Amino acid sequence: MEEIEHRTVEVNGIKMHVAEKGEGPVVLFLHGFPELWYSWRHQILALSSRGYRAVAPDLRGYGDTEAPVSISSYTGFHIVGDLIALIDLLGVDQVFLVAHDWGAIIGWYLCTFHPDRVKAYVCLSVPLLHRDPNIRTVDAMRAMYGDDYYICRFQKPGEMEAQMAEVGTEYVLKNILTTRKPGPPIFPKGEYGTGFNPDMPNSLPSWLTQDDLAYYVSKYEKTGFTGPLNYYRNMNLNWELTAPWSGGKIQVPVKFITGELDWVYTSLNMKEYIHGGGFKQDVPNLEEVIVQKNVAHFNNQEAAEEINNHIYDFIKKF
Structure with missing residues (x-):
């Protein structure tokens, strides 16, 4: 950890905190919500120990990276713009990509726009968002799960931030990180309440230390949740803007890994898509x-060694 190198770089007009370690083919790690570069700590160490250059930035709006104020600065194109600039800086033509949650959606965009830049992709938890020309991303979620589905509840500017503020940052982060409840996260109306986890444990599960939680908390207490929430607020806009790639296929090699109890895996008809043939199509x-x-949901932290090995074995074929 103390050997991990932290720097601030200038990419696509913002200032981005980059954590990295090791030399060799770059393995670029992209975290999601409500995560940080820190979420990848076990993968950074392991992969850098095996002759790979491990790179994990805080994404736009997160952690120690610049957080633009406008909701409009958080389209997938903005994030991919950041990352193309970062990769150009690292000095490589291609990278290996590993990603989780929002990091994985951004990772899919990168593979859509620049497959030539991604050798192979280890995708955690979130399979490709299939673009249905007949219905917008969030419209489809609201039709399926109603207005209290978390992604719908994240849409209205300021609201979720206020609801999270009432329960406090530490509660929100513990609530989400500790959850093991399968299926669509549906919030109680009008408030955060039990949010993602109606069965919160007194003690943290054994994959998360008091210090780990404190690191997350210290960053989020500074940045708030607005930048991260802004990604979700651009989902319908991403759907409009990604129209040029309608009915396209992704030719990058992919290894998809998920926890059995992951809420994404157990919602949005994802099991059918994943195993049923669509994902492969x-x-x-x-x-x-x-x-x-x-x-x-947090499989790279909960099952860190397994993940490390799956990443390595996969990328080494190349």
Whole structure:
């Protein structure tokens, strides 16, 4: 950890905190919500120990990276713009990509726009968002799950931030990180309440230390949740803007890994899409789908060694 190098770089007009370690082919790690570069700490160490250059930035709006004020600065194109600039800086033509949650949606965009830049992709938890020309991303979620589905509840500017503020930052982060409840997260009306987890434990599960939680908390207490929430607020706009790639296929090699209890895996008809043929139809070189038994949403932290090995074995074929 003390050997991990932290720097601030200038990419696509913003200032981005980059954590990195090791030399070799770059493995670029993209965190999601409500995560940080820190979420990748086990993968950064392991992969850098095996002759790979591990790079994990805080994404726009997160952690120690610049957080633009306008909701409009958080389209997928803005984030991919950041990352193309970062990769150009690292000095490489291609990278290996590993990603989780929002990081994975951004990762899919990168593979859509610049497949030539991604050798292979280890995708955690979030499969490709299939673009249905007949219905917008969030319209489809609201039709399926109603207005209290978390992504719908994240849409209205300021509202979720205020609801989170009432319960406090530490509660929100513990609530989400500790959850093991499968299925669509549906919030109680009018408030955060029990949010993602109606069964919060007194003690943190053994994969998360008091210090780990404190690191997340210290960053989020500074930045708030607005930048991260702004990604979700651009989902319908991403759907409009990604129209040029309608009915396209992704030819990058992909290894998809998810926990059995992951809420994404157990919602939005994702199991059908993943195993039923669609995912492979969109992603011809989807190789192995791995479902980790008794592991939930934060699988790279909860099952860190397993993840490390799957990443390595996969990327080494190349």
